[PDB]
Every structure is written in C-alpha cells, then in structure tokens.
Design a protein around this ligand. Structure first.
Ligand code: HEM
Length: 119
C-alpha cells in the first residue's frame, strides 16, 4: 500500500515524486522534480535543509534516517500540516540518493485536538 514517497539527490534536488506525493503536497511530478525538496516545508527548516543534508554527508551521523520523525510539511497552497517522515539511503551512479516516505498526520492531530477540547 503506497504512501507519499519522494526521491532526492545528495543536493536535495527532487528526482522522483510519487502520485500520492502529488495529492498530498499539491505539486505535480513535472513541477516538483527539478526543485529542491525544501519547497515542501516552511521556514526555518526550509532554509536550513541543505545544511541538514550537508551536515549528515560529512558527519555520517543521522538524526532522522533509521529513526524517523514527526515534522511540519507545507503544501503548494501554502497550508502546513503534521507528518511523519522516514528516510532511506541509497546509492546510484556512485552518488548518494535519499528516499523519503511521508505519512500525513492531519486527521490524527485533529482527532487528538478535538478529544482534547471536548474535555
Ligand atoms: C517535507 C518536510 C520535511 C521536513 C520538515 C524535513 C526536516 C528535516 C530536519 C529538521 C532535518 C535535520 C534536523 C536534525 O538535525 O535533526 C532533516 C534532515 C534530512 N532530511 Fe528532511 N525534511 C523534510 C523532508 C525530507 C524529504 C522529503 C527528504 C528526502 C526524500 C529529506 C531528506 C533529509 C536528509 C537526507 C536529511 C539529513 C539526514 C539525517 O539527518 O538523518 N527530508 N530534514
């Protein structure tokens, strides 16, 4: 059962954008592909994302890879949302590539929030 998956190169450039990713983020394949993955997140992560990838490539010490994390994503329409992110590392043509699997947690957040306010 497919999820929103994205594939970037070692510079954060999108290479593949799944159909489900399109529905979640609001960007079509063609629109996303040549863009930096940072277009899918609000600030401050956005401007710091390249340094996150860079930091990892040099230190080889993961903070999300093999760990997973829940973060805020940003749609094309400008709206933000909570999402769980898992990152896999791969190799192709001698260069590193990264695979991201996104799980939308909007509903989860809403339910939890609704239960919270209804006492
Ligand atoms: C769309 C919302 C996203 C957010 C908010 C986000 C956020 C972050 C943050 C906060 C870090 C490093 C912070 C720390 O030092 O612990 C990070 C690292 C990284 N992100 Fe993202 N990211 C997103 C999407 C993606 C996607 C889609 C990919 C690849 C398909 C990706 C690949 C990476 C890589 C390779 C690293 C560094 C490796 C590591 O520290 O484990 N990120 N991201």
């Amino acid at each position: 059962i497919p999820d929103a998956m994205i594939v970037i190169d070692g510079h954060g450039i999108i290479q593949l954008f799944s159909t489900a990713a399109e529905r979640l983020f609001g960007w079509s394949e063609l629109e996303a592909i040549g863009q930096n993955v940072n277009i899918l997140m609000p600030e401050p992560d956005r401007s710091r994302h390249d340094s996150y990838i860079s930091r990892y490539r040099t230190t080889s010490d993961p903070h999300i890879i093999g760990i997973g994390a829940i973060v805020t994503g940003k749609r094309r329409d400008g709206t933000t949302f909570p999402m769980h992110l898992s990152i896999g590392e791969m190799q192709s043509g001698g260069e590193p590539y990264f695979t991201g699997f996104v799980r939308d947690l909007t509903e989860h957040q809403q339910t939890q929030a609704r239960l919270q306010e209804l006492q």
